[PDB]
Design a protein around this ligand. Structure first.
Ligand SMILES: [Mg+2]
Ligand SMILES: [Mg+2]
Ligand SMILES: [Mg+2]
Ligand SMILES: [Mg+2]
Ligand SMILES: [Mg+2]
Ligand SMILES: [Mg+2]
Ligand SMILES: [Mg+2]
Ligand SMILES: [Mg+2]
Ligand SMILES: [Mg+2]
Ligand SMILES: [Mg+2]
Ligand SMILES: [Mg+2]
Ligand SMILES: [Mg+2]
Ligand SMILES: [Mg+2]
Ligand SMILES: [Mg+2]
Ligand SMILES: [Mg+2]
Ligand SMILES: [Mg+2]
Ligand SMILES: [Mg+2]
Ligand SMILES: [Mg+2]
Ligand SMILES: [Mg+2]
Ligand SMILES: [Mg+2]
Ligand SMILES: [Mg+2]
Ligand SMILES: [Mg+2]
Lengths: 180, 51, 134, 65, 234, 148
RNA sequence: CUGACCCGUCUUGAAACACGGACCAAGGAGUCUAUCAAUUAAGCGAGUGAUAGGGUGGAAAAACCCGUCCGCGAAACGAAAGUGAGUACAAGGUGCCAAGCCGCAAGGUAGCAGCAUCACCCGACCUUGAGUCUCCGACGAAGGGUUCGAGGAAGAGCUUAAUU
RNA sequence: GAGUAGGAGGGCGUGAUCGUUGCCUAGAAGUAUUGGGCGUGAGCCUAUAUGGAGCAGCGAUUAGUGCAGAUCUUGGUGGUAG
């Protein structure tokens, strides 16, 4: 008998989600990056693996405007890789020359990036280009969603700015003085 | 990078009974052993006198 | 391919038979009866089929890649050789087609066992024709 | 009916169960309890300080003044 | 074509690194085994040195009518006498800090207002004492185990002592024993290196576990006496 | 469906994970049916997750007709995104005449400025404009035209 | 030889002098419809998706094509009248901090997502105003808040299935 | 390496549907077993006897899917008892 927490069987939450997707291709891409991860001591690949094993919802959108906004002098020559789907921002007027690598390009994002003199890359290609991730730029998109506003603090606790779940927005809906 | 094969162990053995283990940990042992014999083999005449 | 096909057919293959959670295959080219990338002849490149004929002749079937050609050599599944030397011939053929150590061992197994098998079969067919006559 | 009125027995242990959570030390703290006088001062002294990088149109406003 | 060739090259490269490493290592190990021997010998010499020193100081004293007090033990050993169930949470945690998490667990600790005060709470659940260097050695040879990247690894080779503690200047079991007994510059890592000792049933019965060693019981410091206990358990 | 559901894994455990003490019972346990006792024993619920549920707000509309209140909004940033690329480029190079964008045909009525505009000139035909919409339109080298 | 009270149940407490059970077969109890949410896999993405219905089609109620509207998202704040993410060339600062690039190492450079904070912005409520005109009501250069919001600030949604 | 209430992960067994591989008047299902074995366990395979027409595996789809109890339903039977 020993007094160890969780009996030394403590589960490790520090790990990479085992993905259940069914596109045979994700599983394969993943075989690839498992290789690159154990046999390459490059953080970049390990990173790619963690983020490609993401919850369907945990993959977040990259927009052309997002890329454009994050660009340094060196960011421009560098391969841009998002772990996610890349999409067009209709409100981006001129589109730079880009070599981008994502999982998925909205056909609009593709058309505009290509017709601007750009190149679209897939991770099997990226592997071949720079396994160490040399001169590569890994884009982590910003995280927004509606769910987030119902979370946080509860709706009507002191200083709660969180949103209530309501079936309609009207003067009559949870917009009237509560029972105070 | 090239593939390494996994870590190796040797099941614990008890130095106190098993010599080779003692020696692999502390070769000085062998010396202190032999001395202990030779120093003990010190003759009975020498013992008597020293007493 | 052998990778994509593995993932695709690993579970639903029509050559599949299970025993106590051990998956075996009916594949004619299986180098091991068991269902594994390697066991599965219709998937990867190395697979062999062997049939007896004309008293020593082994029909060797060399799993061959999917082919769009000018002439059709044999079944799309594979290539078909009649070998009259059989055992020795096929042993060579194997040595050529299976470079790695294990695959060699296995194919060869398929051979030894195959042959002695075909011998017994012969004996029995003999006794059978001599049974029909006498 | 009869009941046990108030016992604090299991509650202490319950509280120590997952540890006592302590908040995060954040470099920058909220402004509650700080008077407006001082606050306006901060606002002004920040707006006018060049060694503090503002937004573009902001610097336009600051440099015009 | 090219693939196979590049591999073959890999092979040659490999046999190469293997030879380089083989001879370099060999040299290194000759150096080592020598080191080990020199060290062990010298160390033992230093022990006997100090012990004798004590003897004679005592003698001059006795003759003067004056007395000579040897420096006070800087290393103690504690073994867990009592089970897990039904213990004040503080006590539990104090035990955890002393790294005795089960029954018949021995460990080494420094002697500090810090450490000594942290033992006030566990006194009735444990015996501590001042071990002889001999005892220490015996423990580390019979009960020796090492904490390796989390694993519990039998102390057999010295390669291990070099692996984790090598850079501190601990190459050998004997060295370990030395920083332990001296309590030198790195005690801490020398210790953590050492897996908590899982002991045996004492051959002598314990006396009374409800009682302090002072009452003929077992709980407390048996100052010098801890050794006897260790002897019974080894 | 069915073989995924809890029941299957609950068969033989006797309480169906409803508890031995508190078992699965009728409305009394629900705390009364539906929105029952929201104001009483359910106070905490209502207050906490639907604060402002009970009460009245300002002005009754006896018959509310939405159709005439109908006013889709557009922002400056999406303007050029409405008309094709052909257009804005061809009049970037050509300064002879300037582009007319009818927000109307796109199904929008009021134009609000949100982002900023290319320096290339435009005319925008809309039902309403915001002070800033007009600001940025004019400053760009562009013009605002009122439609019905 | 050693060990061995009757199960199910409610109970702090069941072998109980608590209740049900003489025996056996077959039957026998968290479903179905709708609703919102969280998570998981799918598709497409500033969009997404139809329904109704049209048009074809297997023997057949399938399937396959079309489907100007509609839903939901894309703008918010106001009871409301109403206004609308205010210097065209903007899309910030700071503290924590990941990749890439340097470096044997120590550390250096950079700063994606998130968290905290300060700043700006739209609207509610206050406060202030030269001047302008279709001058009696609107417009607006300049200048603000101890405050309010299920909001801006390089859009993250929409449809499908499943579980709770 | 304890565990009621409770939760999670894997697995056993039953209909029917779309597939895939097959078995049966040279004897299917069902039934009895002090025949032989396989699983820690749901359960399984075989043998013999009976039986005399349908069955079975594997991947999915779906569920009126697993009973010792509810003074539970219907039916059949005991001891009391010649
Ligand atoms: Mg144990
Ligand atoms: Mg409203
Ligand atoms: Mg707590
Ligand atoms: Mg005793
Ligand atoms: Mg006691
Ligand atoms: Mg479940
Ligand atoms: Mg349970
Ligand atoms: Mg008995
Ligand atoms: Mg009974
Ligand atoms: Mg009684
Ligand atoms: Mg009752
Ligand atoms: Mg239809
Ligand atoms: Mg809407
Ligand atoms: Mg910022
Ligand atoms: Mg049925
Ligand atoms: Mg018959
Ligand atoms: Mg089965
Ligand atoms: Mg018969
Ligand atoms: Mg099934
Ligand atoms: Mg039944
Ligand atoms: Mg029954
Ligand atoms: Mg009767």
């Amino acid at each position: 008998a020993i007094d160890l927490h969780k009996q030394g069987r403590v589960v490790k939450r520090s790990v990479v989600r085992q993905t259940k997707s069914t596109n045979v291709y994700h599983k394969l891409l993943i075989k690839l990056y498992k290789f690159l991860v154990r046999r390459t001591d490059s953080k970049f690949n390990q990173n790619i693996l963690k983020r490609l094993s993401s919850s369907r919802l945990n993959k977040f959108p990259l927009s052309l405007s997002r890329i454009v906004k994050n660009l340094n002098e060196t960011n421009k020559e560098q391969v841009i890789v998002s772990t996610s789907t890349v999409t067009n921002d209709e409100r981006l007027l001129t589109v730079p020359k880009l070599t981008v690598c994502a999982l998925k390009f909205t056909e609009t994002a593709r058309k505009r990036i290509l017709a601007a003199g750009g190149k679209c890359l897939t991770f099997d290609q990226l592997a071949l280009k720079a396994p160490t991730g040399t001169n590569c730029f890994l884009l982590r998109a910003p995280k927004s969603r509606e769910a987030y506003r119902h979370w946080g603090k509860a709706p009507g606790q002191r200083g709660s700015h969180s949103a209530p779940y309501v079936r309609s927005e009207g003067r009559k809906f949870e917009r009237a003085h509560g029972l105070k | 990078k090239v593939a390494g094969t996994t870590e190796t162990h040797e099941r614990k053995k008890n130095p106190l009974t098993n010599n080779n283990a003692l020696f692999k940990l502390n070769p000085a042992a062998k010396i202190v052993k032999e001395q202990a014999k030779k120093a003990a083999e010190a003759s009975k005449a020498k013992r008597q006198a020293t007493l | 391919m052998s990778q994509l096909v593995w993932e695709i057919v690993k579970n639903n293959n029509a050559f599949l038979v299970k025993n106590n959670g051990v998956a075996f295959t009916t594949d004619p080219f299986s180098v091991t009866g068991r269902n594994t990338q390697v066991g599965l002849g219709f998937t990867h490149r190395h697979g062999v089929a062997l049939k007896g004929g004309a008293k020593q002749a082994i029909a060797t079937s060399l799993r061959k890649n999917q082919s769009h050609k000018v002439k059709k050599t044999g079944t799309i599944e594979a290539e078909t050789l009649t070998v009259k030397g059989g055992v020795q011939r096929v042993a060579k053929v194997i040595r050529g087609r299976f470079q790695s150590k294990g695959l060699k061992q296995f194919a060869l197994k398929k051979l030894v066992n195959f042959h002695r098998a075909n011998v017994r079969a012969q004996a029995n067919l003999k006794a059978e024709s001599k049974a029909k006559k006498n | 009916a009869k009941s046990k009125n108030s016992t604090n027995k299991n509650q202490i242990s319950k509280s120590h169960r997952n540890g006592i959570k302590k908040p995060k030390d954040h470099r920058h703290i909220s402004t509650k309890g700080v008077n407006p006088r001082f606050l306006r001062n901060r606002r002004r002294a920040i707006k006018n300080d060049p060694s503090i990088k503002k937004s573009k149109n902001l610097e336009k406003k600051v440099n015009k003044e | 074509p090219e693939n196979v060739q590049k591999k073959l090259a890999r092979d040659e490269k490999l046999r190469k690194a293997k030879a380089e490493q083989r001879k370099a290592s060999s040299a290194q190990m000759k150096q080592r085994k020598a080191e080990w021997i020199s060290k062990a010998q010298k160390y033992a010499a230093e022990y006997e040195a100090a012990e004798k020193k004590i003897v004679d100081e005592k003698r001059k004293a006795r003759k003067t009518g004056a007395f000579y007090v040897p420096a006070e033990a800087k290393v103690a050993f504690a073994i867990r006498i009592r089970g897990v169930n039904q213990l004040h949470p503080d006590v539990k945690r104090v035990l955890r800090l002393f790294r005795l998490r089960q029954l018949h667990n021995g460990a080494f600790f420094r002697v500090n207002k810090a450490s000594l005060n942290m033992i006030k709470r566990v006194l009735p659940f444990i015996t501590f004492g001042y071990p002889t260097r001999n005892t220490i050695s015996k423990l580390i040879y019979k009960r020796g185990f090492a904490k390796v990247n989390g694993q519990r690894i039998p102390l057999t080779d010295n390669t291990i002592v070099e692996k984790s503690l090598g850079k501190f200047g601990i190459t050998c079991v004997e060295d370990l024993i030395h920083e332990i007994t001296t309590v030198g510059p790195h005690f801490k890592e020398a210790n953590n290196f050492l897996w908590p000792f899982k002991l045996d049933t004492p051959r002598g019965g314990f006396r009374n576990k409800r009682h302090a060693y002072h009452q003929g019981g077992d709980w407390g410091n048996r100052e010098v006496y801890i050794n006897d206990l260790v002897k019974a358990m080894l | 469906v069915s073989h995924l559901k809890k029941t299957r894994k609950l068969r033989g455990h006797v309480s169906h994970g409803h508890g031995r003490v508190g078992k699965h019972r009728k409305g009394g346990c629900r705390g009364g049916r539906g929105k029952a006792g929201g104001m009483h024993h359910h106070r905490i619920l209502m207050e906490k997750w639907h604060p402002g549920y009970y009460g009245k707000l300002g002005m009754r509309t006896f018959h509310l007709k939405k159709n005439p209140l109908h006013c889709p909004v557009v922002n400056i940033d999406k303007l050029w995104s409405l008309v094709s690329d052909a257009t804005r480029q061809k009049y970037a190079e050509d300064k002879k005449k300037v582009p007319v964008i009818d927000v109307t045909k796109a199904g929008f009525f009021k134009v609000l400025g949100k982002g900023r505009l290319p320096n290339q000139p435009v005319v925008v035909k809309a039902k309403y404009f915001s002070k800033t919409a007009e600001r940025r339109i004019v400053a760009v080298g562009g013009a605002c035209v009122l439609t019905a």
